[PDB]
Amino acid sequence: EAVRRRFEELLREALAFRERTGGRRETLEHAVRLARELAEFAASHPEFNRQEAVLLAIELMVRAMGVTMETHRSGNEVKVVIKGLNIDEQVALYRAVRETSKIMGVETEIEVEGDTQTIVVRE
Amino acid sequence: KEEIKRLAEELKEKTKNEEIKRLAEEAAELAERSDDPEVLEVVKKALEEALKSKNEEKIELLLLVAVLVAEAGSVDAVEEKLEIALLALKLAEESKDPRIIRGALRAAIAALRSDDPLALKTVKEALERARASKDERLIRAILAAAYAFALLAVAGASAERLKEAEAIVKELIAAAEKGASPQELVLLVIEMMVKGMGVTMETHRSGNEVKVVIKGLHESQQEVLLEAVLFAAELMGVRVRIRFKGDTVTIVVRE
């Protein structure tokens, strides 16, 4: 459960950086570092599930950017539909999802179209 | 002479950006060391422009101008680099289309951040041809292909692969001036990234949409393709549907 307390701490740092800089690209490359900093903390916790760890990386970026998301869980597949992303946010979102999943070791099937990015997290 | 530092420090507190805060200090340090009357004139000028602008790209490209001039010591050594920004910055005052202003500035910043001679050469040539024509669909197409060819140089492609991509930039501008659809102008940017990164593709032309399948891209390379495809597709007004799965990138291009 200690992964949860690290999540809430990184989320304050993610929202606070949204107010200070207010830059359409400096907050993104920063928030991606925080999403990977969460994936590193949970990669060395063999108790924590690898899917849910990536989902908290996704939920960390969603609130850092100011968009909304919907979680669809179906057995061992978790589909996260994120809506309202521009180009910089989707390039920043895809980077954060690629590295946090590489660190946790889960396969991600990501589909980008328009302003919506759909992420599937298997294991 | 001084009087440069206080102009550069005022930008630091005004801005909220971190890169602006770092380059402004870096410009105040490098310019203080140089003693060229031509350099302290540019640096002083570039700073006064950034203080008036509310655009984090206009400020960043102007700062990166004063840095690359004072660090170079003289103005003749960065005469091309200067015109690359001077064209891109010119292309921002006149044009009112937000696609053009954001495109022309990011293309210069990416090229100036890279060091490849073939990259700066292609960008200056591309901005000369963009600033000449009064056609908006051509200017938006030259910038799409320029910013996509700059991201190949920032990612560090091989010398013989940027050459293949450069010929594609040349075919894209030529096809854009002859009046190619925004869909095919996007498919030329995908081919530039395919040829640029040393992979291959298949082209399905079924109905009004095009399917492209790309395999063999590392995750660091898929990030460059997505950024180049999304940005060029926005400059053309063209719907794209990119699906990732391992090393296989599938692109669906609609008009």
Numbering used by the authors:
A (entry chain B): 2 to 124
B (entry chain A): 3 to 257
Lines from the paper:
Several natural systems exhibit ‘facilitated dissociation’, in which an effector (E) can bind to a target–host (TH) complex to form an excited ternary complex (THE)20–26 from which the target dissociates quickly. We set out to design protein systems that undergo facilitated dissociation. We use a switchable target binder (host) and a flexible effector that can rapidly bind to and switch the target–host complex to induce a large steric clash with the target, forming a strained excited ternary complex. We show here that by explicitly considering excited intermediate states when designing coupled protein systems, a broad range of facilitated dissociation systems can be designed.
We used X-ray crystallography to structurally characterize multiple states of our designed systems. The unbound structures show an open hydrophobic cleft in the new designed state X poised to bind the effector, and the effector-bound structures show that binding the effector causes the two switch domains to register-shift into the designed state Y. Structures of the target–AS1 complex show that the target binds as designed (top), with some strain suggested by small variations among the structures (bottom). For (1), the target dissociates 20-fold faster from AS1 than from an unhindered binder fusion, probably because of minor strain in the target–AS1 complex.
